[model samples]
Target: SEDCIPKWKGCVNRHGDCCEGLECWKRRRSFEVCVPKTPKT
Candidate 1:
């Protein structure tokens, strides 16, 4: 779902731009977005 955390195109270094627990989705080549974790029931 769109509300869900960002979908990661590939795994990245946890200490890199994106860190652990964070979600990142790739909308296009060379483009990625950092999203927050959604709440669960």
Candidate 2:
């Protein structure tokens, strides 16, 4: 599923990084995924 990214939390990418984003954060005792920041918005 290269065309699709995992929306579930705790998911890891091929590089061992968070799959949904550049980094992962823990909020309210659960890790929240932060999607990659776009250069243009």
Candidate 3:
């Protein structure tokens, strides 16, 4: 996991490939929010 900060867009990962148990949700550009990982749809 590269970044593990929730709702704090500050990463480069557009997908959930950073946090091991979390998800990386990017905003638009130069922003990646680290949030909890969802196992459902």
Question: Estimated TM-score per prediction?
Answer: 0.34, 0.26, 0.35
Best by TM-score: 3
| 1 versus 2: better lDDT goes to | 1
Q: Write the per-residue lDDT of candidate 1 for residues 1-41, one digit (tens) a residue.
A: 23223345343332134444566655556555654557789
Off by over 4 Å in 1: 1-21, 28-30
How well is each residue in 1-41 modelled by candidate 3, as lDDT tens digits? 34445455444745554446666765665556666767876
**Candidate 3 segments exceeding 4 Å error:** 1-9, 13-19
- Global lDDT for candidate 1? 0.48
Compared with the true structure, what per-residue lDDT tens digits does model 2 show for residues 1-41? 46333444453333245454444444576655544544756
Report the candidate with higher TM-score, 1 versus 3: 3
Number of the top lDDT candidate: 3
Which run of 10 residues does model 3 get worst, by summed lDDT? 1-10
- The C-alpha lDDT values of all candidates are 0.48, 0.46, 0.58
| Global fold similarity of model 2 (TM-score) | 0.26
